Design a protein around this ligand. Structure first.
Ligand SMILES: CCCCCCCCCCCCOS(=O)(=O)O
Ligand SMILES: CCCCCCCCCCCCOS(=O)(=O)O
Ligand SMILES: CCCCCCCCCCCCOS(=O)(=O)O
Lengths: 155, 162
């Protein structure tokens, strides 16, 4: 996607759907890449704070990741445990956001994608765009959640 | 669910032999998610019985080993529909097949049809058949699936798709 206005993706988001290239990365509620985005907050430094949930050590834990802008407008660099690049595939700011995360050292084995939406409702158009994008990427696991799970901690 | 194969009739003799679980999908994530999830089963062989029933050799990951089991799917008065004695799955529905390449089937609890629904795409050889996967996806479009899994040929050739 050509260009991102960070100010315009601020606020609450819900992880409506996920997909990954390796099954074991989303294989469990405690799988390494099973993360639920909650809020995107621009920082005074111009970076993007990501508030998300992850099942860790037997509890739903909050994690804070900083996405720094790069020379490519849709690509960010995150200091995270298992991923280091986030690519925003598509967004309308107002309804949905499609992104992918990967570890640049192992791009194929680490690729995961998510469909984020602004409200805890099944956005069929967002899921259609997400599936169309996934058609061209080597995904072997796909997960989708219902609004009740979307309103629960760690779904 | 529409058992499309019911109209065409099912010839058990022509489904005999080796099969590979290329893809699976389920309405409830927790039933198919983990490697030891209850409905994460891998069909190995179909063997018609003298009674017209269908013996099924399958693999299942349990307690850090995988295990093999033989189950008997019993014929019914409706073609492509079978009864299986399992803890919480009791009906197998053969959605589609061409006998020579792919076989789309589903398993469900008739008592709890939607929360228990799982479906699989079986193929004759350990290769990715994207036509089979496309028929599988078209069938899944009308089912309330929330998890989908597909495997690569090496996993197809491995015990328990390890
Ligand atoms: C019988 C368990 C019910 C748990 C419901 C949790 C639903 C959240 C999404 C599925 C993750 C769960 O996947 S799991 O394989 O780790 O259980
Ligand atoms: C423009 C912002 C769009 C990105 C929002 C979601 C990115 C969060 C990625 C989590 C990485 C998880 O990394 S991990 O090491 O904890 O598994
Ligand atoms: C070509 C048709 C193949 C049909 C295979 C059906 C496999 C049955 C798996 C039941 C899982 C067991 O679940 S349980 O929890 O109830 O024991």
């Amino acid at each position: 996607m050509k260009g991102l206005d960070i100010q315009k993706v601020a606020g609450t988001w819900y992880s409506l759907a996920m997909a990954a290239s390796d099954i074991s990365l989303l294989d469990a509620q405690s799988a390494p890449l099973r993360v639920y985005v909650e809020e995107l907050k621009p920082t005074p430094e111009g970076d993007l704070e990501i508030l998300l949930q992850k099942w860790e050590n037997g509890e739903c834990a909050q994690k804070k990741i900083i996405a720094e802008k790069t020379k490519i407008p849709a690509v960010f660099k995150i200091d995270a445990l298992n991923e280091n690049k986030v690519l925003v595939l598509d967004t309308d700011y107002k309804k949905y956001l499609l992104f992918c995360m990967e570890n640049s050292a192992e791009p194929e084995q680490s690729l995961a994608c998510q469909c984020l939406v602004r409200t805890p409702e099944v956005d069929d158009e967002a899921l259609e765009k997400f599936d169309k994008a996934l058609k061209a990427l080597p995904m072997h696991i796909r997960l989708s959640f219902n609004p009740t799970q979307l309103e629960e901690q760690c779904h």
